[PDB]
Ligand SMILES: *[C@@H]1O[C@H](CO)[C@@H](O)[C@H](O)[C@H]1NC(C)=O
Ligand SMILES: *[C@@H]1O[C@H](CO)[C@@H](O)[C@H](O)[C@H]1NC(C)=O
Ligand SMILES: *[C@@H]1O[C@H](CO)[C@@H](O)[C@H](O)[C@H]1NC(C)=O
Ligand SMILES: *[C@H]1O[C@H](CO)[C@@H](O)[C@H](O)[C@H]1NC(C)=O
Ligand SMILES: *[C@H]1O[C@H](CO)[C@@H](O)[C@H](O)[C@H]1NC(C)=O
Ligand SMILES: [Ca+2]
């Protein structure tokens with residue numbers, strides 16, 4: 010009894026298109042594409058989110074369940090006649106003129122009883138198919154089985170869909186008007202198509218569609234990955250023969266972080282450009298970026314304004330005090346993002362989450378009840394984040410009270426060096442104590458076990474340790490970053506120079522960094538101010554970590570306070586099973602709490 | 611969960627007139643000598659195989675006059691075991707697996723895992739292929755290429771051979787074009803393991819296809835014996851494309867206006 014109407018207002022528009030943009034020499038041609046508008050007036054258009062950034066030349070993804078009814082209001086703002094044909098239903102519209110189509114997504118269009126919740130088809134202008142598709146009028150059309158789409162039509166389950174069109178656009182068949190003007194592309198892009206990001210060991214659904222001539226034939230290859238054919242039959246393919254006029258869907262479970270390539274692997278074509286890198290993020294990428302632990306310096310925080318004494322340098326999760334948060338006198342920020350706090354990672358990183366908190370003068374609560382998040386790589390071009398969002402942008406829900414932490418996810422991971430937060434709703438005044446979450450873009454940068462426990466106690470062993478007869482024992486396996494309670498760290502029985510703390514990674518791992526933290530117990534701030542690393546593969550014999558060129562051991566600067574964190578990266582990673590920290594300098598007493606970073610090999 | 615070993619290497623070798631070409635060769639122990647295979651398998655390289663769980667280790671020793679690599683297209687490798695070069699932002703320790711210089715020898719380590727192998731509704735052993743990525747149009751054409759086979763639990767032999775099936779071949783309907791290779795030698799050549807219209811040691815019957823071609827291409831291998839059973843149902847013929855492999859006296863031709871009318875035929 011479903012028959013839900015799915016409204017779409019799509020127009021055909023002339024634009025300039027630059028293949029290669031994210032990579033040739035002048036590859037921009039006039040083109041005509043399917044653009045998504047917000048309503049019948051075709052005045053304001055529906056901004057393209059992060060979820061469909063990879064779409065490139067394709068139009069908005071029309072989508073629908075079975076028995077559903079698709080009604081699209083086609084405007085057509087181009088100079089000549091065009092049309093919107095939906096290949097898979099089962100007349101040339103003149104410029105500046107509208108016309109509503111009405112398609113009934115029958116069972117014949119849906120997927121198969123066994124696998125893949127959704128099936129791929131395609132829509133495009135049909136006045137002159139070939140000359141039109143080659144001009145840029147083509148888009149993905151998905152048909153799912155009842156219950157696959159959510160209130161605001163997106164896949165929740167398998168989730169994470171991708172729509173790649175492997176095809177050659179021959180500008181010699183369009184607004185040519187007047188050499189080989191051919192582009193062996195993916196979604197109309199050559200060599201680099203941005204927007205492809207997924208999580209390690211996560212199931213994504215691929216919709217591969219090739220609407221090109223007979224000489225196309227493209228063997229889509231996902232490096233280091235294995236495609237899966239889900240249906241009344243399951244087959245593990247390693248590459249898939251995508252033939253002309255065909256549409257195919259096949260899931261894939263990404264494996265291992267890093268930058269991998271996507272190509273047609275029909276050599277001659279692949280080198281012409283039918284390829285793009287695609288990013289696989291670490292499975293547990295959501296670690297504190299440093300606002301709440303000290304890793305991010307006051308220098309890196311900056312706002313456009315702040316209500317007297319509630320300075321930006323204060324917006325740190327949990328930081329307590331009379332003045333312990335950033336507050337703006339006004340959140341007048343509407344079609345303006347003026348009230349904002351900016352965090353500069355100083356380098357690009359992966360942002361996958363944001364946590365906010367309010368402040369409390371004394372008894373008067375202060376907090377943000379809603380905000381927006383913008384990012385940039387240069388600091389010049391910003392992008393207001395969107396994803397699920399039913400509005401032009403994502404309007405994250407803020408806090409309810411002034412102390413509880415509000416957790417917010419970023420639909421699809423984004424790359425940024427500058428995160429810009431701006432309150433759009435509040436109780437009294439937009440106060441904010443916040444923390445950003447993520448990891449390194451290149452992966453292999455997550456914790457190894459110190460703080461969780463994956464690394465068990467019977468793995469941490471130090472030269473010496475304390476045990477004062479007042480019931481205070483500081484065993485080595487307590488040097489777990491962020492420890493609390495009784496004895497929360499490692500105490501060096503002696504504060505000399507040749508003391509050591511080592512961890513048994515039980516196997517050879519890839520060590521990319523380390524985080525060190527002091528300890529504030531018995532009212533005495535003691536911590537390791539400097540160290541040196543030694544690594545072993547079998548157990549004995551150590552090789553002092555040295556720089557790209559030297560013979561002296563490496564001196565890593567540690568912390569300068571009791572609670573703060575300090576991160577050190579190993580330019581050339583460490584490949585071993587044993588790691589040793591050799592305190593060289595400190596304050597009052599040698600104590601520790603640490604965590605390592607790296608991945609399996 | 612055994613471990614597999616291989617010591618295949620790259621080397622130039624004249625080849626049926628003749629041309630100077632490159633091919634992958636098996637080699638053994640620590641690279642003492644190879645045990646060629648005249649019976650068909652013309653330019654076709656070795657034939658790498660393993661089973662789910664088998665942490666295989668492929669040793670490569672280049673001897674050609676151009677840097678090359680081992681690019682398996684069917685395994686979940688890592689950056690230092692992939693075999694390709696592009697901006698993946700990795701460090702040199704991980705870049706020295708992409709290009710192996712003329713005379714150097716490195717070992718690709720592939721941890722063929724469970725969820726990276728055959729399904730249950732598919733053949734007992736999946737067929738894939740490998741080649742050198744260092745240069746796609748050259749390497750292949752210059753004769754480089756080679757079948758890879760990932761099998762299921764107790765389906766492969768302890769001596770590297772099909773189990774309860776035995777005697778499976780490896781036809782490689784692959785058209786070459788010497789114009790695009792080592793030498794600027796204008797010579798098209800629709801083959802079947804390198805061999806043209808003929809001169810290919812067939813094999814009578816007592817009763818694993820590939821289809822390279824560097825450019826856009828589709829091969830329609832038509833067998834003359836109902837021995838082609840895909841899963842649980844037979845098909846008259848099989849179809850392949852430029853880089854997609856698939857898992858008595860008669861002929862095996864490809865009834866296509868430019869394959870059967872040009873010598874592509876492997877007599878059963
Ligand atoms: C295969 O399809 C079924 C049916 O929709 C689905 O539940 C399952 O998650 C799919 N398997 C994978 C890993 O894609
Ligand atoms: C290819 O031709 C000869 C082989 O006959 C070879 O010696 C030479 O190096 C090559 N020359 C070309 C065409 O570059
Ligand atoms: C013989 O084979 C060559 C290439 O292998 C081909 O050019 C020629 O046409 C073939 N002869 C015929 C027509 O059988
Ligand atoms: C809208 O486009 C049509 C088609 O060219 C044109 O006739 C009309 O003038 C345009 N609108 C205006 C008045 O700018
Ligand atoms: C994104 O926002 C929340 C988190 O799951 C949820 O309401 C929504 O369904 C998510 N989007 C998708 C694709 O499910
Ligand atoms: Ca590599």
Ligand SMILES: [Cu+2]
Nearest residue numbers: 230232272274
């Ligand atoms: Cu590839």
